[PDB]
Symmetry: C3
Subunit: 485 residues, 3 copies
């Protein structure tokens, strides 16, 4: 039944994604819960805005919650009489309906892959979370004569399945590393800033690869017109017009995307401001660092393995760089906040009728939050500074470092060059909130002029590997600093 | 004064236990506090049930606590008029009185050992917590001509004191490792389950060793009738009748034991559900793992040393096994709980009169507990998976591993075989609560049929070591998987 | 402009202190904030004592905070009518004014050093927090012909700048290590106790070095009269009179210093009793251990580097010493506290009207604090005891250990000898609170009799190093136990 599927790219992508998302049933439940998350966010925001009154809740017998909830008829009438909200409601509803249709289609598309796993591979769906991709790939390449997927080419190879899965990720890595994309700017106040978000990456990929009129004809061969040099200026102008149209669309959807981002961030990151307020001072590998430390023909889990093995030294290194003014401010703010909080707590203990005072409880809560977040920037008074033996054990994992880092690891030049590869979680959240605003700007003013050189790139950096199609060249550039398998 | 004590087993057991429980005064205070714990639990439960009224406490001038407490006369009358409670009260009172009598007797029994330490050993009672059992045993064997405990045999030896202390623990280890005890079952829903609790072990030991009519005549020689083969069926039938009677007694005491277990668990494990709600997700060496990883002639602290040195790798290993469905459920439950909790907290901060609403405070508390327990099952996003180099450093400590573990450490066959040696703290608590119920069942239906083979064992697996008595054979079986000193 | 400054001691001290306190602006802001801390403490205590009434706050419409605050006119009248408070107010005001004058003077004194850094060294004030003292000292010694600070001697050397910076710290180390200072006592109840506080060290230094009539003439040469032996008894009697006068002054200022210490400790250590109540069970290197493990000619950061590298093993070692009675008391107190707290929490959850009871909330808070501080003394049930391989890795860092420590590290003789070098944070706080009381006593009865031998020391333990002046002898004594570079 798996003879000449003729979409081996998407087939292998799905075969790999079903192994990553452990099990067909677990993937199904994950997508069900993600649909439920969106539905819950939208419904709960609508409820809070319309039904609840906040007049008899803020107190201006005990007041019970069903007192504040208006009856369903008048709440629905108030929803209807809004308009400005009823527009966003239909927009979100049609988006959710489209998502549900896609999920219904993918259900069968992935049940096919489940059957392929069960029969052609003899791998039970209970032994997937305890099997490795090396074994799955070895079985696929061993049984390649029985299930008979690709005998058009002579045989199937691990290099062929790699090229099939990572065909567009190799192109994105080559672009980002050859600096053919507008992701660096000079900001008065900070200077050099690398701005690379999920929205920007999605837009770049949608402009270049996906779509009916993109650079790639079907899914494994870019249109022949892009392999010649005569029509260079035509191709550049066409790409510029496409980029302009997509940037205009991004600007049109800006309020919707911004509202969704704000709501999701407040729902998914505001309980941490009490449960663990120091969790936003930590760091994570930036979306630029992921595309910068990535080899050619390297799977997502193979990259995450290194980015996990090299995380604790990368936190120790970035903690060995004390900020003096920040430490001073933290110490003094903590002292003042704790000195007020101790008096409040002693008064409350001696007599609790002081909790009924108008603002004492909220004051105490906010002062506790303040002292707990200020105590998070004070480094431990006893930590060993060895910033040279830390890079030697980071470079052993991330495999890529600029040449001017091994000699001088203590300078304030490496720390801010490395901070683009290892950014604050709060900076990630911030630059994700600013994305719906500043994504069209980069997609109109900063990407459209470059539209020429990109089309030069795709013309002279594409190899026709037999049995696979058009892939990106690896050994041609080799101008990534270190280089390592 | 220590000439021919004639109970060297119990004497050496006490000499070792006084070294373990550091100091005579510390052991005395420990037993005083354990008596006080039992008294407090019983008295506090009786108080909460009888005196307090909960009508004028639940509010249906400020209400003060002495308002709820009924006067002593009417509370005592209400205690008296119960009956169903006054029976449990006399039962608990006579149990506590018996315990106090035993403690009074042991006071003098251990002051004798304190004097033996002070005089015959020249070890002050202030240098015990800083002395090792190797030194204590060396001193005992060196001064064995002055204090003159055992010159009936030619000399005293460390092997002799080992055999004297661990005479019954060697038998229990041999039984559990030769599978002559009913501790494994097939449960529809889980499959193979190892059920071994303190109640079961105590009952096994009370059936076999302790008692007037048990297998052992005095304390170091089993009755001669058990060394012959003629009366095999008589001995088996007698053992079966004894097991039946003791299992019937266990079933008769079931409600008392169950009530005590419930009360003690609620008193000693319910503050952790707020103080550290993730502490029940941790793991501990099961009572089966203790008897499985135990050598022959190995003291309790010598076993605990290994079980402590091999605890961190044994936690890392069992954490390297992700549960996909559990992680999905945890992530989604945490998202929903935190999204509701953030709205509640923001409302409370903006205006605190919303805390007077009927259910807001208990809602907030339960939602915080929910999000904090759900966040405990989400593994850290950055952890290295190396499940082969972890068994190599566990086996170096626990010294015992089945043969079919070194080859395949990532399978879902080893993880659930190892989870019988390293169980959840919550599973320990659960199977301890079910013990008063399901202990007689195993003691009537599952142990009574085996009563034949046990008596075969004791007949052909007992060695008469001169100067010590009847001990268990070590080199006869040697069918524990790895083997190591 | 830096030709023959003629106060090279203070000049180099300031050059080093500006490198340590990272940057001129950061040092300025630190001193501003320390002045503000003192002002805030004093003003807030005065406010709490005078303005607030606590009658309409303790409740004997909602009560708002501006209701409790008396109007400024009557609060100022109440401040004026006190007297006993208005005296302390003028004392604190003149102290703060003197501190502000000193700060104004030091502003210019350190702007001079900032200019010296910028011009004579070519080290920008933005590259200081990322430069090392080795590089700063190398630059100072390299450019020593251009800026022309000291060509009176032949050349400048790193040994010369070391001797210039640490001239008095070497003397203090020699005294403390030769036991010419009264810092050890026999206390009935504890026995040998080492009492060394910041007040005692400041008084010792003010008696010996600083001042107009101290032992040192200007700043690098002790008066010639102290280099002869004829006037020994005169010099001893003069030193005794000076010590007596300074001890009398210390006793006169005792209530002021004690009030300040109490207020500062309550303001800076009472929020930790809720934020992290186990933080006072930790340990820190005592002020005696600092002067005991210190080499000759070793800077403060060079000492702190070792005391930081040898902190985790020094905590593991002092945790490998179990206190049996303390562990028993902790376990039992935690059990009882948690058993009461669980009942209170279950009642609150089932019905929240029980929070309005007169003492339930403060009871719950104090019981939570009790159980959380008791749970802090219970050691982790799984920790490896290897107290011999810990001293081998501590001595590698602290470089100094008595001879009778390597053989027997498990005894209860080393643990209490090492506990004078590594003390509880709470013991530090306590012995700092008792300092204003017991500092004059040691300065009248215990230091005044020794005044003879000290003057012997300074007479026969001073070397005239050319180009530097009078320094302390190093190789003369060499009776510190281990010895290491």
């Amino acid at each position: 039944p798996w003879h000449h599927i003729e979409n081996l790219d998407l087939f292998f992508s799905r075969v790999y994604n079903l192994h990553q998302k452990n099990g067909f049933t677990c993937m199904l439940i994950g997508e069900i819960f993600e649909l439920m998350q969106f539905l819950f966010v939208v419904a709960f925001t609508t409820f809070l805005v319309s039904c609840v009154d906040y007049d008899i809740l803020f107190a201006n017998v005990k007041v019970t919650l069903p007192d504040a909830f208006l009856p369903a008829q008048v709440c629905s009438a108030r929803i209807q009489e809004n308009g400005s909200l009823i527009t966003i409601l239909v927009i979100a509803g049609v988006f959710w309906i489209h998502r549900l249709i896609k999920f219904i289609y993918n259900i069968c598309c992935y049940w096919e892959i489940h059957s392929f796993y069960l029969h052609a591979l003899r791998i039970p769906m209970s032994a997937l979370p305890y099997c490795t991709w090396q074994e799955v790939q070895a079985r696929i390449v061993q049984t390649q004569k029985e299930h008979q997927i690709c005998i058009h080419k002579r045989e199937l190879t691990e290099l062929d399945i790699y090229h099939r899965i990572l065909r567009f990720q190799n192109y994105m890595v080559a672009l980002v590393n050859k600096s053919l994309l507008p992701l660096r700017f000079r900001l008065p106040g900070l200077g050099e800033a690398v701005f690379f978000t999920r929205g920007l990456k999605y837009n770049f990929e949608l402009i270049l690869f996906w779509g009916p009129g993109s650079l790639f004809l079907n899914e494994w061969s870019l249109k022949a017109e892009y392999k010649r040099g005569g029509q260079r200026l035509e191709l550049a102008q066409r790409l510029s017009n496409r980029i302009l149209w997509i940037g205009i669309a991004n600007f049109l959807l800006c309020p919707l995307i911004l509202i969704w981002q704000i709501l999701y961030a407040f729902f998914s990151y505001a309980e941490v401001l009490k449960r663990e307020p120091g969790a936003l001072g930590a760091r994570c590998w930036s979306l630029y660092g992921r595309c910068y430390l990535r080899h050619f023909n390297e799977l997502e889990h193979e990259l995450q393995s290194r980015l996990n093995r090299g995380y604790k030294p990368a936190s120790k290194y970035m903690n060995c760089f004390l900020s003096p003014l920040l430490t001073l401010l933290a110490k003094n703010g903590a002292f003042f906040a704790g000195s007020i909080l101790a008096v409040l707590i002693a008064l409350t203990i001696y007599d609790e009728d002081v909790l009924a005072v108008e603002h004492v409880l909220t004051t105490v809560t906010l002062l506790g939050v303040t002292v707990t977040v200020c105590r998070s920037f004070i480094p431990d008074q006893h930590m060993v500074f060895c910033p040279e033996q830390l890079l030697r054990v980071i470079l052993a994992h991330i495999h890529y470092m600029p040449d001017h880092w091994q000699g001088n690891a203590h300078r304030s030049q490496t720390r801010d060059e490395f901070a683009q590869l290892f950014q604050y979680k709060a900076v990630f959240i911030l630059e994700e909130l600013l994305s719906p605003i500043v994504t069209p700007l980069i997609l109109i003013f900063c990407l459209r002029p470059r539209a020429l050189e990109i089309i030069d790139f795709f013309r002279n950096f594409t190899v026709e590997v037999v049995g696979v199609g058009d892939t990106c060249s690896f050994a041609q550039m080799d101008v990534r600093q270190h280089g390592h398998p």
